[PDB]
Amino acid sequence: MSRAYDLVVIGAGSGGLEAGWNAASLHKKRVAVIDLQKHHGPPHYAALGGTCVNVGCVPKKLMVTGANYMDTIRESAGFGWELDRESVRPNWKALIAAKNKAVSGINDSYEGMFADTEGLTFHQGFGALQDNHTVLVRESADPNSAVLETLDTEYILLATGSWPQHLGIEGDDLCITSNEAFYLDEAPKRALCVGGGYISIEFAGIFNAYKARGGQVDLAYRGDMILRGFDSELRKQLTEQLRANGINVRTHENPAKVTKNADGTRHVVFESGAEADYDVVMLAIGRVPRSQTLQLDKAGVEVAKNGAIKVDAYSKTNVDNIYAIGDVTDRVMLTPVAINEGAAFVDTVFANKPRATDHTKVACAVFSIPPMGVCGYVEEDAAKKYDQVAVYESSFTPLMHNISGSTYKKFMVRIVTNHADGEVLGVHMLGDSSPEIIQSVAICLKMGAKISDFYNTIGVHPTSAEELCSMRTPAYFYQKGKRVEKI
Amino acid sequence: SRAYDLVVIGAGSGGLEAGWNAASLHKKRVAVIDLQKHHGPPHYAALGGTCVNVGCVPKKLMVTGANYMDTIRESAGFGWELDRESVRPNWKALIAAKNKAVSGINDSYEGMFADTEGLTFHQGFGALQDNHTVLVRESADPNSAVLETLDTEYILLATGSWPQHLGIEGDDLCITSNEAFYLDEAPKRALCVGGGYISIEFAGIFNAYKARGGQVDLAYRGDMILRGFDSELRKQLTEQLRANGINVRTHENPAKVTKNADGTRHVVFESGAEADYDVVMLAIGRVPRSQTLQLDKAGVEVAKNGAIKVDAYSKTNVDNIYAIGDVTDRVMLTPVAINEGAAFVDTVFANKPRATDHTKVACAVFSIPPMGVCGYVEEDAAKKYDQVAVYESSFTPLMHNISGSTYKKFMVRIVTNHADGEVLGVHMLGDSSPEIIQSVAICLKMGAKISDFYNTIGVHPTSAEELCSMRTPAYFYQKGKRVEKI
Numbered sequence: 001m002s003r004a005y006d007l008v009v010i011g012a013g014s015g016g017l018e019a020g021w022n023a024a025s026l027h028k029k030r031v032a033v034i035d036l037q038k039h040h041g042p043p044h045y046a047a048l049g050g051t052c053v054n055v056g057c058v059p060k061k062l063m064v065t066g067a068n069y070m071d072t073i074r075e076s077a078g079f080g081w082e083l084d085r086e087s088v089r090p091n092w093k094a095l096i097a098a099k100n101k102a103v104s105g106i107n108d109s110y111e112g113m114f115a116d117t118e119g120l121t122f123h124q125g126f127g128a129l130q131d132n133h134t135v136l137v138r139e140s141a142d143p144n145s146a147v148l149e150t151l152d153t154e155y156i157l158l159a160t161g162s163w164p165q166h167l168g169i170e171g172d173d174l175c176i177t178s179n180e181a182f183y184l185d186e187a188p189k190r191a192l193c194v195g196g197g198y199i200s201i202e203f204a205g206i207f208n209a210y211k212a213r214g215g216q217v218d219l220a221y222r223g224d225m226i227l228r229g230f231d232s233e234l235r236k237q238l239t240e241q242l243r244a245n246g247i248n249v250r251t252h253e254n255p256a257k258v259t260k261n262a263d264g265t266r267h268v269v270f271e272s273g274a275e276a277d278y279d280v281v282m283l284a285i286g287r288v289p290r291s292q293t294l295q296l297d298k299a300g301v302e303v304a305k306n307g308a309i310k311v312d313a314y315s316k317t318n319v320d321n322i323y324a325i326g327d328v329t330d331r332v333m334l335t336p337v338a339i340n341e342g343a344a345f346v347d348t349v350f351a352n353k354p355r356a357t358d359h360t361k362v363a364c365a366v367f368s369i370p371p372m373g374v375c376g377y378v379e380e381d382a383a384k385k386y387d388q389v390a391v392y393e394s395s396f397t398p399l400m401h402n403i404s405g406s407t408y409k410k411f412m413v414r415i416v417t418n419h420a421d422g423e424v425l426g427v428h429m430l431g432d433s434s435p436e437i438i439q440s441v442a443i444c445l446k447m448g449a450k451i452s453d454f455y456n457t458i459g460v461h462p463t464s465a466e467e468l469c470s471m472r473t474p475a476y477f478y479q480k481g482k483r484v485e486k487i
Numbered sequence: 488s489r490a491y492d493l494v495v496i497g498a499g500s501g502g503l504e505a506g507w508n509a510a511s512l513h514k515k516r517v518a519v520i521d522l523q524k525h526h527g528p529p530h531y532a533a534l535g536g537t538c539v540n541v542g543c544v545p546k547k548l549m550v551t552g553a554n555y556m557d558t559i560r561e562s563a564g565f566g567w568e569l570d571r572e573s574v575r576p577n578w579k580a581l582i583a584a585k586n587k588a589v590s591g592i593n594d595s596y597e598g599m600f601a602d603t604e605g606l607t608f609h610q611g612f613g614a615l616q617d618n619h620t621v622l623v624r625e626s627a628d629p630n631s632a633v634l635e636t637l638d639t640e641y642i643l644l645a646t647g648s649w650p651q652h653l654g655i656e657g658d659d660l661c662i663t664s665n666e667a668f669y670l671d672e673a674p675k676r677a678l679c680v681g682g683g684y685i686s687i688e689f690a691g692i693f694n695a696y697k698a699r700g701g702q703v704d705l706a707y708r709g710d711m712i713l714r715g716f717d718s719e720l721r722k723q724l725t726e727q728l729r730a731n732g733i734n735v736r737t738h739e740n741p742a743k744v745t746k747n748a749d750g751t752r753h754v755v756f757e758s759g760a761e762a763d764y765d766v767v768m769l770a771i772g773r774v775p776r777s778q779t780l781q782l783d784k785a786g787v788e789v790a791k792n793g794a795i796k797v798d799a800y801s802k803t804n805v806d807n808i809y810a811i812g813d814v815t816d817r818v819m820l821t822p823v824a825i826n827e828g829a830a831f832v833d834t835v836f837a838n839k840p841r842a843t844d845h846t847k848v849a850c851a852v853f854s855i856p857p858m859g860v861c862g863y864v865e866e867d868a869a870k871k872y873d874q875v876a877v878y879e880s881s882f883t884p885l886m887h888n889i890s891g892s893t894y895k896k897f898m899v900r901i902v903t904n905h906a907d908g909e910v911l912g913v914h915m916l917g918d919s920s921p922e923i924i925q926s927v928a929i930c931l932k933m934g935a936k937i938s939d940f941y942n943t944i945g946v947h948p949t950s951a952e953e954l955c956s957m958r959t960p961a962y963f964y965q966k967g968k969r970v971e972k973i
């Protein structure tokens with residue numbers, strides 16, 4: 001045309017593909033999506049479908065599902081299931097092969113999508129900017145490589161995601177990150193997860209279920225407690241449940257130096273001086289916005305210090321026809337948020353239905369064993385926003401577990417309210433099914449539920465979630481930031 | 488004045504709520520009567536009620552156990568190697584573990600009466616001599632020994648319900664869920680008669696614990712199991728029941744049951760079909776247990792079937808006699824019984840009249856896989872509103888590509904009033920739907936409309952996030968008539 005394409009998307013991931021397909025399918029726009037690869041795995045790891053499909057949500061969940069069988073096969077003994085317990089063994093190679101066929105199945109569906117959505121096209125290569133109206137598809141991330149394509153477009157959407165952060169330390173190249181974790185051929189007998197975030201804890205559980213019999217999994221983390229940013233009672237009890245299933249949680253610990261040993265194992269010396277030896281050292285310390293090879297200065301797009309592309313409520317940049325979504329904008333790095341921003345962008349730009357994504361009261365899960373589901377503010381946050389805050393709590397060991405022998409499995413729910421009017425500002429739980437229970441709780445929190453709304457619903461019995469409906473009396477309060485006990 | 492403020496007959500889910508709140512909160516003298524102090528034969532229930540003893544608590548423990556059959560099966564896909572021909576379910580170990588759990592709850596209740604001043608337990612069959620005198624006797628027989636007499640200002644009858652029997656010959660050789668909890672061996676061939684949640688729940692428990700060559704038959708008169716639930720989910724669940732090995736026999740009803748020389752029972756079906764089974768469990772319905780209470784000499788009205796007629800506030804036609812829970816036959820679930828017990832104590836001793844909302848009650852079926860349901864079924868909703876829109880999803884979770892249980896479809900169906908978008912009912916089939924529905928009911932009590940579901944951001948990867956993903960109706964009921972175009 002007077003512009004060959006309507007939109008060029010860089011990144012065929014969660015947001016990118018939502019954006020790309022609705023603009024084409026619903027609005028009949030000519031959309032080009034660029035990505036580095038068509039199927040998961042090395043060298044790029046992510047591919048069509050993004051990080052979540054390929055080296056993220058979907059494979060980690062199957063791998064956590066697989067890991068959960070260590071506890072359910074142990075637990076069947078208390079309900080009468082007799083089996084030769086000595087014969088039980090995990091097979092990591094069997095897991096990675098089924099995960100690999102599941103993930104490649106998805107990859108093949110996306111190809112089909114493009115095949116029958118007129119106006120939608122996959123362009124493979126490294127996307128980079130020439131100016132706000134020309135996108136280059138290059139052979140490599142290097143600015144000097146052969147340009148394969150030069151796409152002239154009206155609108156540019158940048159949806160390139162995140163990448164694993166590294167440690168500055170000597171030996172970093174002898175460490176893997178979650179990307180490689182998915183493709184290991186043998187499960188580590190001893191593994192060090194470093195970081196205290198959800199990817200670290202989730203991977204500590206997987207390695208723990210699949211390790212060989214004298215194995216050990218350590219999780220090292222700089223802070224005082226893992227999962228900073230979560231409810232602190234929940235973070236204390238998940239540390240105890242983790243410990244109870246054998247992960248050695250070593251807080252205030254950080255790698256100093258990693259050295260290759262003769263046999264292959266790595267030798268970590270910790271900043272404390274402490275040193276040990278592991279098959280695998282996996283760094284899960286952070287995820288950084290992946291903006292650096294796009295040549296954003298060619299179009300003049302502004303980025304933050306950490307690389308986040310700065311965007312307004314509507315995801316637009318400081319260049320009027322360039323928008324950005326997902327992890328590269330560094331707001332809430334979760335797939336369903338990337339998708340939502342993906343959809344709000346097409347309503348705004350092509351459907352003149354201007355929406356901004358609401359990044360408040362976004363629920364999320366940690367698929368540790370046992371998992372967590374969390375939504376809204378933590379009481380220390382609430383205590384510096386509200387005047388009168390009430391904290392309701394409840395703790396119990398599912399009766400099941402007095403029969404299965406994992407008596408350490410306390411289900412726990414913490415509700416944080418604004419005590420002036422009873423509106424629920426946060427709901428935090430630890431225990432099985434909590435990922436599933438919290439979905440619909442977020443529906444209540446977006447509606448503006450009060451604690452009355454919760455204790456007046458008749459419970460479904462016998463369930464864990466019926467605790468939600470039984471917390472009538474506050475456990476303690478915060479009169480103006482200070483933990484009070486009567487308000 | 489009277490010796491007692493309240494005499495509760497039936498120390499179950501409703502009555503223990505009612506007696507402990509009136510004593511502990513209001514400082515009343517409450518006398519609570521039950522037939523025994525510990526679960527088990529001969530009366531099965533005991534202090535704590537049918538749920539604690541021969542109900543929700545044991546059954547859920549037995550379903551959780553039944554479920555390991557599926558998870559040890561399914562673990563192979565994720566790389567767990569096991570000597571799979573060594574796996575044997577042991578019933579006696581299940582029942583024992585169950586019995587140890589229930590007895591400990593029974594002992595909690597010993598403790599509760601020990602420290603609540605004013606609450607006491609009196610053991611025997613309670614029966615009415617007039618509207619201020621309750622008599623505790625040795626047995627249901629009117630001419631049995633009167634162990635003690637209680638003079639009271641109010642009476643609350645919370646006596647529950649009991650298995651419905653089939654009038655056929657051989658009915659004396661069928662068991663019901665009461666005896667199912669106390670069986671010695673797993674039945675290898677079991678017949679579960681009934682299309683309801685108890686029938687389907689026990690068929691799934693027997694299917695997992697039976698001996699290797701066995702079979703569970705689920706027989707029902709109707710056309711499809713689980714009358715009252717969403718039809719599509721009744722349709723889907725039957726397949727998944729069959730896929731795990733249950734011979735589901737619809738349009739079937741025992742006509743006659745006889746004993747065989749080895750004490751297996753022989754059933755002659757109304758179809759002329761014939762079959763032998765170790766156990767024939769009648770789970771055809773629950774009937775209000777009002778018949779031994781001598782309600783007639785206190786002038787109390789019962790319905791045809793035996794429900795004690797009570798108004799919104801659980802008050803009978805006799806001003807100081809109330810009845811709550813199953814015996815009133817409003818919604819026979821435990822949290823409703825409990826709720827009515829607290830409402831009654833507010834109405835009578837706090838004089839804050841409350842009445843129980845029996846309208847948007849969520850309920851779960853702990854079948855394999857389970858169900859979580861709440862609100863209107865589209866057929867009912869379409870009778871009340873003339874623009875209903877039905878939304879629906881089903882997907883097989885990826886886990887189940889890898890586990891091999893590819894028959895396990897998760898399914899959610901939302902029924903709305905299309906005019907305002909108010910959500911009238913949410914119906915789910917699949918694992919965790921009991922848990923997910925609890926919070927869906929909170930939404931539904933607060934008046935959630937469908938845009939509230941889909942404007943929420945999803946928690947990925949979970950089945951629950953499908954709730955937030957339905958923007959388009961599948962069809963509609965225009966003025967009672969189904970239409971897919973309004």
Ligand SMILES: Cc1cc2nc3c(=O)[nH]c(=O)nc-3n(C[C@H](O)[C@H](O)[C@H](O)COP(=O)(O)OP(=O)(O)OC[C@H]3O[C@@H](n4cnc5c(N)ncnc54)[C@H](O)[C@H]3O)c2cc1C
Pocket residue numbers: 010011012013014015016034035036037044046047048049050051052055056057058060125126127128159160161162178199290293294325326327328333334335336338947948
């Ligand atoms: C181990 C792990 C676990 C996770 N678990 C969860 C979970 O359970 N739930 C959840 O919601 N979130 C989870 N996430 C995060 C989730 O993956 C992301 O929020 C989501 O994928 C971000 O969407 P996005 O659109 O920003 O980018 P992505 O899906 O990251 O899209 C990135 C895409 O851009 C491509 N790309 C990059 N540079 C270029 C270029 N120059 N040219 C062309 N293409 C390029 C990448 O190859 C490509 O796949 C997890 C992530 C990890 C790593």
Ligand SMILES: Cc1cc2nc3c(=O)[nH]c(=O)nc-3n(C[C@H](O)[C@H](O)[C@H](O)COP(=O)(O)OP(=O)(O)OC[C@H]3O[C@@H](n4cnc5c(N)ncnc54)[C@H](O)[C@H]3O)c2cc1C
Pocket residue numbers: 461462496497498499500501502520521522523530532533534535536537538539541542543544546611612613614645646647648664685776779780811812813814819820821822824
């Ligand atoms: C097999 C089965 C499974 C169930 N599963 C569930 C479930 O998972 N969830 C759920 O919510 N509900 C379930 N229910 C139903 C639930 O058990 C009942 O709705 C509930 O317990 C009834 O409460 P109630 O207070 O009316 O009476 P109950 O709890 O039945 O209490 C009855 C009490 O009355 C006593 N009694 C009777 N007559 C007399 C008398 N003359 N004198 C003295 N004592 C007397 C009984 O012995 C006694 O325990 C289940 C029921 C059954 C049987």
